[PDB]
């Protein structure tokens, strides 16, 4: 299911400085958060994409769509959860 990438491009363009909440409500540790910060010093969208990529690799096949549209609810982030729903509905 490539719909994750369509949803992934929505998230990279919808959350900025508060990306740490995504890496904490999801399956990422604080040491990995610091590693992600180090890997991309100046960029931010690369970091927000990398946290999601790490989470996807961790969850393997369990988390495809709903485990993201619902993981964007416990960390607030409802608006991005609404947006990823819309892209999946159309395509």
């Amino acid at each position: 299911e490539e719909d994750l990438c369509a949803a992934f491009n929505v998230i990279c363009d919808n959350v900025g400085k508060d990306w740490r909440r995504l890496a904490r409500q999801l399956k990422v540790s604080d040491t990995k958060i610091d590693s992600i910060e180090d890997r991309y010093p100046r960029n931010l969208t690369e970091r927000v994409r990398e946290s999601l990529r790490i989470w996807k690799n961790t969850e393997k096949e369990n988390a495809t769509v709903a485990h993201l549209v619902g993981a964007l609810r416990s960390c607030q982030m409802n608006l991005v959860a609404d947006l990823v729903q819309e892209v999946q509905q159309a395509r």
């Binding site: 400085k17 607030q76 982030m77 409802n78 608006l79 991005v80 959860a81 609404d82 947006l83």
Partner: protein, 94 residues
Amino acid sequence: SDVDLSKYITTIAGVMTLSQVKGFVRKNGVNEAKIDEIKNDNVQDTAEQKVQLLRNWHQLHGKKEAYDTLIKDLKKANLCTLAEKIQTIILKDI
């Protein structure tokens, strides 16, 4: 209506003052920790505090039924003139 506030956040936040924005969001499901984080993140910077508070509210408040509840709370806030200003701004933009 079904207007989208994603491209209107900057302007509307510009219209409102900081005290009114703070009181409204605190009265519309925003805690104190986020308010303090915005305060100490953008100290001596209010034009960005307004935008950050509005963005955080509308982010936890989803897409559907956002402008409507904004105007409803402003009407209950006895500040309808700002709501009319928002309506004129949206009508001119669209």
